[PDB]
Amino acid sequence: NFMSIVNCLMQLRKVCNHPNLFEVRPILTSFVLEHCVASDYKDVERTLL
């Protein structure tokens, strides 16, 4: 369908002039890993104490 082409042309126009396609630039957040291997051994340390 030509309307799909017209839509794609609209996003091309809105992204080429400026990065306005949802304009999400990552803030570079760190990984927030929650394993905390020390938690797997704090119980053992408490039992030892």
């Binding site: 082409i5 042309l9 091309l12 126009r13 080429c16 002039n17």
Partner: protein, 77 residues
């Protein structure tokens, strides 16, 4: 914008015209750029057109130059 005031205003305080984007420009660009083109102009009119590389703009402009810019119906690469 193209449909904001680039139709019939008589601005004459400038001497340069810049076109950021023109998807369908067999006619609209002419009146948009000539809005500043007025009798009360004592200097030449510079027209700047913005195109990118390996994009739709470059393909459209080059194919318009190939066919003397008659009418664009299908854009592909």
């Amino acid at each position: 914008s193209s449909r904001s005031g680039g139709l019939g205003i008589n601005l004459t305080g400038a001497d340069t015209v810049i076109f950021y984007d023109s998807d369908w420009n067999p006619a609209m660009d002419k009146q948009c750029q000539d809005r500043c083109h007025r009798i009360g102009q004592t200097r030449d009119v510079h027209i700047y057109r913005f195109v990118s590389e390996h994009t739709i703009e470059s393909n459209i402009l080059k194919k318009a130059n190939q066919k003397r810019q008659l009418d664009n119906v299908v854009i592909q690469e």
